[PDB]
């Protein structure tokens, strides 16, 4: 019954709300990853920095979705935020593997929403996703795949040495 | 079994984790309040801005707690984040009343943690709370009490007129 | 019945009001000391300047207490201000002795209020006192003890000569 | 028995001391008015600012009188300072009415002292009053009369609305 | 019999003197650690730099204690300074382990003094410790725990390689 | 068995270590002298400043010796540091007399080491001492002799007056 709402299905509105939840969940995951790498018994500052910056990015993603929801005349609805999947994240390798799984999950959710927008004939949504989300996920996933490759080549017969060098020479300088 | 951990009780560690949850919960509440006031059918930009800035502040509070947890050798543990208490926040008056209830809840939690720190003889915790949290809450609650008073004097026989003027002349310029 | 007031006892509120009175009293004392040293028959400009700056500092102390009273939701209550204890302040030595007695009185009052805050479990008050008052009094009392020592070493067989040199070479340049 | 004192009657000296007391009393009144408008349940920052600036001005008035007293070879004598006439100041209208009563009292005291100076043939006193006091009081009283007029036109069928708008649009920007 | 001394127990005064000795001892230890890593047969400039900066910090700590002792009217008393516990400090790992033991000893001494200040009801001492000492020790110990973790992950099957890389890539750049 | 060590006798190495101890001892003495003159019952800031700057200079002397020890391939060895010879230093005159005794002791130790270097045919040591130590001691002793002369001419029939004037007009401006 919005005065402005036009060509904006209830189905898309609902899916946008679910995606917001997924992005806040991802932000929460990165916050946890960040503080894990900041533990005195883990102490990989560059890895902490990588994940803390991702927490911010995911939060910004959610906020961008919510703004758009309002611009189209939809109603934000928030749900419980489930805690991250792990309390301890193991090695940089383990963490980066978990990060790529997470981003692929987000990406597929974006792709699903794009498909719904296409089916509903909502070119504004499709443009919005294209402009602000799809390329960002692709670039991020490529960068994470890059990191994983480099971590894997390093962590050979001397795993600790490799983990230190990656953090020192690839991450946060 | 931390190498650094010293004079840091398990009781304080647990309470710090609970407080982090409370601050993230509060951040989530403010995010919801913010986007509500950004709805086209509510449209009070200064009120949105007030709450969005509080969402950031509460998040920063949580992150400060987590950093300290790590500095003392404690282990961050994250739990589910419950969604805000309302989906719609009514008038600016209603929102500001809900905001003060929330901040008083946070404040009492800080005071409870201070008391636990005192009982455990943990002067670092007590100083940390004093320095970064207690004064901030007091100042915020005073400002919110100030706003509530002004909202109440305005929303007299002409409520809409008063709500508009408060947003225009007190909030976000 | 304040909307904001939290963990703020009536006992602390009352003691804060008494302390305000003590600080304004002290300001009044310094105003009198200042103008005494400005008399044409006393004429010690550096001593006048020392006390006039203390009058301002004590006033600022009172105003800081009152602001805090409001921040906590207490009610300022003002009482009569008793005039300074002397109309004429004698030598610089006499004045500086009277000044140290006065500051020790203020200091003990601050310490008493801190103890009351501790008993009432009011860590905000305790932090407030610690931050803005306790160190300031200690530094001031040390400086006054320093001055007294130097005045005393000077005012030997030639008291007037010593009083002039102290004012000229230690005070207000 | 002053070396400098010339054409300075004991009557004028005494009256100057009384006037100092009146100006410090007025300063004290404004301090109280200021902190009242800073209460969380009153919260009119521009009104607080108006009165706090008047407290400073009245204090400066007293100090100017005392300096002059010394310049003429008179002796400052301080008396008890009576507390302000009210603990709570009601509306901005009530406060501004009380402020004008107070300033008229000061003004009449200045006029009385001028008349005494004239009778004693003390042109220095008369010039001093003229230069630093009489015009200042006239300008202040006019400004307060201006404010009262505007408050009165505002506080019509909607008193709270009027009090808010006056504070926002006339006072402290 | 000090003119200024107020609320400053003999017990606290004595404990402050002991703590000064402990901090100068620690400074002396770091001086020794520094010059060890500067030996031509050890030659780890970044490790030398880390310890030389700690020697300065500990000295500054002692001087801060002594200044405070004087501010409160206590009397500094100096005792013999015992030489460091080792003449040769082994590996960077060994040194960093010894450094953390030392800082924990200092920290516990600060905590003991805080407890004594609390028992004696000396809020100035408690604030002083809180402000200038407790947080500094916590931050330092965390940083040392961080370093130890990184040293340990490096010094794997190739200890010399790890010691070189840590000095080059973590310390003094 | 050093790789670099050349023309550096064990006798010189040992004497260098003893001299380091003497210079650190002297630093410790000056630290004590400094804080004595900072007592509220002594309060001669310029005298405190003179000795605190000497504490730093002596420390720097020791560190210069240690660096050189390493440059030549010798091994620093640290011993206990004996506390200063007095707990209270009396007048500025007494202190300055004690200071000159101390510096003459250091100077003679430098001269003894130079003689040992000459006997051992160690021109690098002799140059090092000449360059960085011998002239510095001579200049310092001359300055102290200058001060003593001026203190003595002042502290005549009015000792306190003289001590104040020296501190004010010769020392730390
Ligand atoms: Ar993840
Ligand atoms: Ar709320
Ligand atoms: Ar006084
Ligand atoms: Ar008034
Ligand atoms: Ar150590
Ligand atoms: Ar000495």
């Amino acid at each position: 019954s919005s005065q402005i709402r036009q060509n904006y299905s209830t189905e898309v509105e609902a899916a946008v709300n679910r995606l917001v939840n997924l992005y806040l969940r991802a932000s929460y995951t990165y916050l946890s990853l960040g503080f894990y790498f900041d533990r005195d018994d883990v102490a990989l500052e560059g890895v902490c920095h990588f994940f803390r910056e991702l927490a911010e990015e995911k939060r910004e993603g959610a906020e961008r979705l919510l703004k758009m929801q309002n611009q189209r005349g939809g109603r934000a609805l928030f749900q419980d935020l489930q805690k991250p999947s792990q309390d301890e994240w193991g090695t940089t390798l383990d963490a980066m593997k978990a990060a790529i799984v997470l981003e692929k999950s987000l990406n597929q959710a974006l792709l699903d929403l794009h498909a719904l927008g296409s089916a509903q004939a909502d070119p504004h949504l499709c443009d919005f996703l294209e402009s602000h989300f799809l390329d960002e996920e692709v670039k991020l996933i490529k960068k994470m795949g890059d990191h994983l490759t480099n971590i894997q080549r390093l962590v050979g017969s001397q795993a600790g040495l490799g983990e230190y060098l990656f953090e020192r020479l690839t991450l946060k300088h």
Side-chain angles (χ1 to χ4, degrees), chain A residues 50-130:
Chain A
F50 179 77
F51 290 122
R52 297 215 52 191
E53 286 297 307
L54 285 176
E56 163 178 0
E57 231 80 278
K58 293 302 139 190
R59 181 187 44 266
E60 287 171 344
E63 288 173 8
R64 201 166 289 114
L65 284 164
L66 293 160
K67 173 186 170 176
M68 176 274 290
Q69 180 84 285
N70 270 167
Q71 283 183 139
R72 294 293 304 276
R75 292 305 171 237
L77 286 172
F78 295 97
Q79 298 295 170
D80 297 330
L81 289 180
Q82 81 189 247
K83 74 184 186 174
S85 71
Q86 291 175 51
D87 293 324
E88 294 195 346
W89 301 94
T91 61
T92 304
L93 182 46
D94 292 327
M96 194 65 64
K97 277 168 166 174
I100 207 154
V101 166
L102 175 64
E103 293 299 329
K104 276 157 115 164
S105 84
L106 279 177
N107 195 219
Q108 185 60 59
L110 280 170
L111 294 184
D112 293 347
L113 180 58
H114 191 290
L116 178 62
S118 191
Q120 292 279 167
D122 185 345
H124 183 274
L125 179 79
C126 293
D127 175 69
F128 170 84
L129 257 20
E130 289 165 17

